[PDB]
Amino acid sequence: VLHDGFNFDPAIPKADEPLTITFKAPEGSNFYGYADDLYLHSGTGANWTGAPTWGDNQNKYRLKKTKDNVWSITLSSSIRHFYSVAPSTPLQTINLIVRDAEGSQQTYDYATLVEDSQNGFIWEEPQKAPLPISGEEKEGIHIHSATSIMLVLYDKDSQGGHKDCVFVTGNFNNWKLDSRYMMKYDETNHCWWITLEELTAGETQFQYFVYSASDGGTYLCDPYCEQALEKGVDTNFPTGAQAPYVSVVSTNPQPYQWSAGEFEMKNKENPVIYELLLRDFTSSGNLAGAMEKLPYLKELGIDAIELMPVQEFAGNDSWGYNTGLYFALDASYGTQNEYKAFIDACHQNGIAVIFDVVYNHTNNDNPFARMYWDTFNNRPSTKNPWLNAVTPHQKYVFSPDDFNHTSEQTKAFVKRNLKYLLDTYHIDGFRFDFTKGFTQKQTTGDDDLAATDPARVSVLKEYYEAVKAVKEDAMVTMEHFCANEETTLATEGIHFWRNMNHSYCQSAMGWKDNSDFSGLYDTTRPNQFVGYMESHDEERCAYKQIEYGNGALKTNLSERLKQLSSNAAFFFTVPGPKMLWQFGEMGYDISIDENGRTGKKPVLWEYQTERKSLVDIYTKLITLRTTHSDLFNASSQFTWKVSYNDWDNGRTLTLKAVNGKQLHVYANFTNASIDYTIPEGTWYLYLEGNPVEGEKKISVPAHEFRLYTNFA
Numbered sequence: 221v222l223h224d225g226f227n228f229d230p231a232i233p234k235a236d237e238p239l240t241i242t243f244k245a246p247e248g249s250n251f252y253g254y255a256d257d258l259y260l261h262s263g264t265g266a267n268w269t270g271a272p273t274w275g276d277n278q279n280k281y282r283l284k285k286t287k288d289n290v291w292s293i294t295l296s297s298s299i300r301h302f303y304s305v306a307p308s309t310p311l312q313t314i315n316l317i318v319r320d321a322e323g324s325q326q327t328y329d330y331a332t333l334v335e336d337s338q339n340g341f342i343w344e345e346p347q348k349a350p351l352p353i354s355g356e357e358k359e360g361i362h363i364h365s366a367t368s369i370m371l372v373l374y375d376k377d378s379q380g381g382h383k384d385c386v387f388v389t390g391n392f393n394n395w396k397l398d399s400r401y402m403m404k405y406d407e408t409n410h411c412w413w414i415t416l417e418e419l420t421a422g423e424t425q426f427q428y429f430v431y432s433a434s435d436g437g438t439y440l441c442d443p444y445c446e447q448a449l450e451k452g453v454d455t456n457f458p459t460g461a462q463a464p465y466v467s468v469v470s471t472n473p474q475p476y477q478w479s480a481g482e483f484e485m486k487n488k489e490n491p492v493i494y495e496l497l498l499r500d501f502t503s504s505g506n507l508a509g510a511m512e513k514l515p516y517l518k519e520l521g522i523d524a525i526e527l528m529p530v531q532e533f534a535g536n537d538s539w540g541y542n543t544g545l546y547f548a549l550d551a552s553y554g555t556q557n558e559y560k561a562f563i564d565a566c567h568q569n570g571i572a573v574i575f576d577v578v579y580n581h582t583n584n585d586n587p588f589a590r591m592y593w594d595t596f597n598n599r600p601s602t603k604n605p606w607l608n609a610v611t612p613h614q615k616y617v618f619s620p621d622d623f624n625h626t627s628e629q630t631k632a633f634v635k636r637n638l639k640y641l642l643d644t645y646h647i648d649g650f651r652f653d654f655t656k657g658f659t660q661k662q663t664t665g666d667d668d669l670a671a672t673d674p675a676r677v678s679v680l681k682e683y684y685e686a687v688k689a690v691k692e693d694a695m696v697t698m699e700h701f702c703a704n705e706e707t708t709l710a711t712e713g714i715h716f717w718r719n720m721n722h723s724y725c726q727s728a729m730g731w732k733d734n735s736d737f738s739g740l741y742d743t744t745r746p747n748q749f750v751g752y753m754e755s756h757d758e759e760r761c762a763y764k765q766i767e768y769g770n771g772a773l774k775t776n777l778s779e780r781l782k783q784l785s786s787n788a789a790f791f792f793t794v795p796g797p798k799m800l801w802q803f804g805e806m807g808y809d810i811s812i813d814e815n816g817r818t819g820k821k822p823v824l825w826e827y828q829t830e831r832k833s834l835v836d837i838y839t840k841l842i843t844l845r846t847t848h849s850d851l852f853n854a855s856s857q858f859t860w861k862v863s864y865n866d867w868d869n870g871r872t873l874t875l876k877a878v879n880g881k882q883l884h885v886y887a888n889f890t891n892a893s894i895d896y897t898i899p900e901g902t903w904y905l906y907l908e909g910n911p912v913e914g915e916k917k918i919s920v921p922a923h924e925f926r927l928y929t930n931f932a
């Protein structure tokens with residue numbers, strides 16, 4: 221008789237008969253050993269028709285405690301009568317939460333099936349049928365014709381089980397559960413499948429209703445959809461559909477015409493990457509707005525644009541590290557073809573495109589989450605074959621839905637997604653967010669998490685090789701911050717984020733403490749470390765000047781732009797890839813905390829004019845890496861004096877190519893003029909270039925730098 225959670229007498233609920241619901245609290249569950257009665261919060265259909273006001277303690281909602289940990293309620297006369305549902309309304313699901321009288325403790329959204337014989341909704345045994353397709357990529361949406369789609373949904377839990385039945389519901393059947401739209405299970409491929417025929421018009425909209433005795437029922441969309449509507453964002457979200465997502469398929473849509481040619485990233489070994497958030501890059505916050513600035517970024521001299529995450533994220537106002545769907549791009553920035561047009565336009569301006577991708581975690585809206593959910597703890601169940609119930613790395617819990625990168629299903633999904641983004645959107649590489657998170661080890665801090673995990677190392681190689689198999693020259697960058705695993709993986713050709721924000725903020729402010737630049741240059745493999753003074757995750761160097769700058773650096777914009785141009789002179793002149801965060805080149809100086817860390821920031825394109833002196837220095841330093849590439853080859857000899865102890869008298873670097881070409885830079889980061897003797901040789905002021913005698917004493921004013929080449 222009674223199992224954990226909800227029990228029904230009758231075992232198959234009947235819309236036009238009474239129902240006894242018995243709730244049994246498992247050991248370790250929040251209502252285990254609870255002394256008082258519980259209350260029912262319930263309604264019918266996708267949208268909980270008949271739900272009371274939360275906390276409504278009328279006696280007809282009371283589950284009387286009958287035994288220890290067992291509460292029962294009877295929906296008397298009939299389920300239909302209890303919810304005042306019209307006879308003709310198909311009553312096909314009931315949604316159940318139990319709570320304390322106060323409404324402080326509860327269970328979470330759960331649904332069971334209701335048989336409604338009087339409206340033609342009769343129980344049938346689900347069919348076992350082999351999947352009629354072989355091939356790779358069996359799961360997902362297959363368009364066979366203008367009027368027909370095959371749907372394949374993976375279902376095997378980590379204990380070897382599967383659901384009792386799955387319905388497809390959509391615009392083709394007015395969002396009803398219908399025995400005609402029950403999918404068939406293939407026990408060998410572990411997949412539900414159905415062929416929808418006689419679809420009419422352009423857009424098919426659907427979601428699945430999955431159901432088991434142990435888990436109850438859930439609505440979810442297809443994980444592989446390329447288009448989705450999101451309740452609370454899309455005004456056209458169907459009234460029949462449950463939040464959050466409906467999959468959208470166009471059988472014969474407008475194909476995008478790509479311009480002709482290969483396209484390959486320029487300076488592919490050591491690119492300058494421009495990190496860009498579409499939400500905040502222009503006032504329209506979208507691809508259309510950003511497309512208008514490509515001429516600006518082209519002139520700047522950048523090799524690549526890195527977009528912050530564009531995969532479908534929760535809502536329409538986000539950095540995007542909250543992915544709900546991985547094969548649909550967020551419609552808040554543009555359509556599929558607007559993304560393709562953007563990427564095509566970048567390629568025609570000679571600019572590569574990198575996508576920021578977030579595989580550590582998804583969110584509660586993801587079909588992989590919804591499919592195997594714990595309605596007691598409101599997190600993935602211990603049976604979920606893609607996700608952990610509980611994040612193993614407890615120092616970093618960015619959502620309730622942490623991916624298990626030891627799951628063969630998760631690895632296959634990630635590998636398939638990488639290939640999809642390469643093939644469909646023609647991008648030039650990837651920045652993998654938080655690759656430190658790709659670990660099953662139980663940890664609670666930074667040092668236990670950063671310790672070598674051989675399975676994390678091996679899975680990151682696996683994802684690297686999967687990208688390389690699709691596109692041999694694709695750039696693969698990982699935001700890792702595990703020093704020892706970076707040494708190992710840099711050997712394979714993986715690039716790593718190298719955060720020099722603290723040092724370059726200290727130098728921008730005129731403070732010598734913790735200002736050492738030396739971590740920008742990795743002696744073992746200079747080209748594998750993507751150095752940056754700023755990223756979306758960091759405070760702006762120019763903001764720190766205003767708030768805490770040494771002396772005049774708080775108030776004098778001229779002296780601030782000079783100090784930042786001197787930082788740039790100790791950054792774009794260093795071998796290996798470089799990254800700048802949008803508007804760093806114009807001294808963007810709004811705190812990361814203005815409007816909250818992740819909130820929309822002011823759009824300040826007038827800075828391009830007011831701080832043109834800084835934009836022009838960025839432009840010339842970036843362009844030097846093209847004009848004199850051979851200088852920035854990893855083979856060049858690179859030395860510099862940029863420690864805590866290199867300050868009172870200035871800082872220096874020298875880059876010497878094998879062909880004899882030399883670059884030398886001096887900077888005075890102090891608040892007073894310094895005397896400096898140029899090194900021996902014949903030098904030119906390349907940024908502005910008449911000759912200069914070596915071993916010649918010069919007075920370098922506060923905040924300024926001198927750049928010399930031994931050529932012109």
Ligand SMILES: C[C@H]1O[C@H](O[C@H]2[C@H](O)[C@@H](O)[C@@H](O[C@H]3[C@H](O)[C@@H](O)[C@@H](O)O[C@@H]3CO)O[C@@H]2CO)[C@H](O)[C@@H](O)[C@@H]1N[C@H]1C=C(CO)[C@@H](O[C@H]2O[C@H](CO)[C@@H](O[C@H]3O[C@H](CO)[C@@H](O)[C@H](O)[C@H]3O)[C@H](O)[C@H]2O)[C@H](O)[C@H]1O
Nearest residue numbers: 541542617618619653654655656666699700701719757818
């Ligand atoms: C933010 C960063 O956190 C980690 O980085 C750690 C690092 O692992 C640790 O080693 C150390 O590294 C420093 C070192 O101490 C310094 O000496 C120097 O060398 O620099 C290194 C590198 O900085 O300190 C780092 C900083 O703490 C992690 O490893 C990185 O991957 C992280 N950056 C990524 C990842 C995420 C998560 O996807 C992004 O975070 C943004 O978005 C999330 C999710 O929305 C936000 O999460 C919070 O707010 C949410 C509500 O919006 C909540 O739902 C959630 O529960 C909250 O956690 C978060 O605030 C955003 O920053 C990030 O932007 C990516 O770039």
Ligand SMILES: *[C@]1(O[C@H]2[C@H](O)[C@@H](O)[C@H](O)O[C@@H]2CO)O[C@H](CO)[C@@H](O[C@H]2O[C@H](C)[C@@H](N[C@H]3C=C(CO)[C@@H](O)[C@H](O)[C@H]3O)[C@H](O)[C@H]2O)[C@H](O)[C@H]1O
Nearest residue numbers: 261263266267268269271272273274317326328329462463
């Ligand atoms: C509770 O929510 C409380 C919050 O937990 C607390 O943070 C806040 O201060 O107070 C809230 C109450 O004021 O009450 C919710 C409302 O009943 C309850 O939601 C459950 O039941 C509702 C009916 C479900 N919503 C469905 C119905 C509609 C109505 O159109 C649709 O818009 C939704 O998409 C449907 O899902 C909801 O899903 C349930 O969880 C909370 O559980 C409860 O904590």
Ligand SMILES: C[C@H]1O[C@H](O[C@H]2[C@H](O)[C@@H](O)[C@@H](O[C@H]3[C@H](O)[C@@H](O)[C@@H](O)O[C@@H]3CO)O[C@@H]2CO)[C@H](O)[C@@H](O)[C@@H]1N[C@H]1C=C(CO)[C@@H](O)[C@H](O)[C@H]1O
Nearest residue numbers: 722725726727729730731732733734759764767768769770
């Ligand atoms: C003047 C001082 O400015 C800078 O220090 C500031 C930090 O940059 C800010 O981030 C902020 O740090 C606070 C954190 O926000 C907070 O999380 C918590 O950790 O408290 C921190 C406050 O201590 O505020 C700092 C200013 O208090 C800059 O980094 C720092 O080097 C500057 N220090 C100079 C000043 C003195 C004394 O006048 C000398 O001793 C130092 O050597 C100078 O460098």
Ligand SMILES: [Ca+2]
Nearest residue numbers: 533534535536
């Ligand atoms: Ca969205």
Ligand SMILES: [Mn+2]
Nearest residue numbers: 580622657658
């Ligand atoms: Mn993780």
